[PDB]
Write a protein that binds this ligand. Structure first.
Ligand SMILES: [Ca+2]
Length: 256
């Protein structure tokens, strides 16, 4: 055999599967990766609960927010802010109702229309923060446990949100098809998603494992917008390539 178990998980490889139907997006020249990764995680959770692969409007989330006006193009945020926005507005329009274009990040939050679909209908956030987060560096000496947490969440929810340092994937010979053997950094600045995993034999003939990572830099970047990366990385790295992982704890009735 199947598409997702404890050794191997790649839902992409089943053209007639909910999650595989969630096309890669491009955040453009705005620091909105937090929106794309967060909304994709909700979209996979919805898929897992029997809903259609309908995209959430990133633009609505970028433009609708309480308080003083912020520069939502130059300054990224977090997944905690994504939930905050949901709980505030109770409405997640479909992308078709309010499509994304990065030059429009900053526009007045639009009036919800009658014909708009609410992708957060009947949803709610579980108690007590509404998410669970893990730091790779806190598992430095039990990375097997970190790996198991992420696999379980990928299996059950379809993805996790992960934070990386963008520079670590900006190598001049970056290739989507190769499994990247990358270091991380002490900090992160870019949200992606882990969406699968598997085992491979590396260039030295040794058995290793990889994460399949979804990015928001369009489908030209990497391997159709994804890449594979060694779970443990080069021995000498002080920091794991995956800096942090975030999971949403949402309650959603199971079918529709
Ligand atoms: Ca640093």
């Amino acid at each position: 055999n199947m598409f997702c178990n404890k050794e191997y998980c790649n839902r992409l490889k089943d053209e007639n599967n909910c999650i595989s139907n969630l096309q890669v997006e491009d955040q453009g020249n705005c620091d909105t990766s937090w929106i794309f990764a967060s909304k994709y995680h909700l979209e996979t959770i919805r898929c897992m609960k029997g809903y259609e692969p309908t995209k959430i409007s990133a633009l609505y989330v970028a433009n609708c927010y309480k308080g003083e006006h912020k520069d939502r193009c130059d300054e990224g945020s977090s997944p905690m802010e994504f939930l905050q926005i949901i709980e505030d507005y109770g409405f997640l329009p479909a992308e078709s109702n309010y499509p994304y274009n990065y030059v429009k990040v900053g526009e007045q939050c639009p009036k919800v229309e009658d014909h708009w679909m609410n992708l957060w209908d009947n949803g709610k956030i579980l108690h007590g923060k509404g998410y669970t987060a893990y730091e790779s560096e806190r598992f430095h000496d039990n990375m097997d446990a970190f790996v198991k947490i992420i696999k379980t969440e990928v299996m059950n929810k379809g993805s996790v949100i992960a934070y990386i340092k963008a520079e670590n994937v900006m190598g001049y010979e970056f290739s989507g098809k190769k499994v990247q053997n990358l270091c991380g950094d002490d900090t992160a600045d870019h949200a992606v998603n882990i969406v699968g995993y598997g085992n491979y034999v590396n260039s030295e003939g040794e058995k290793k494992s990889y994460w399949i990572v979804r990015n928001s830099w369009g489908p030209y970047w990497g391997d159709e917008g994804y890449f594979k990366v060694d779970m443990y990385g080069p021995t000498h790295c002080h920091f794991n390539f995956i800096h942090s992982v975030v999971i949403f704890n949402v309650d959603l009735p199971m079918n529709n």
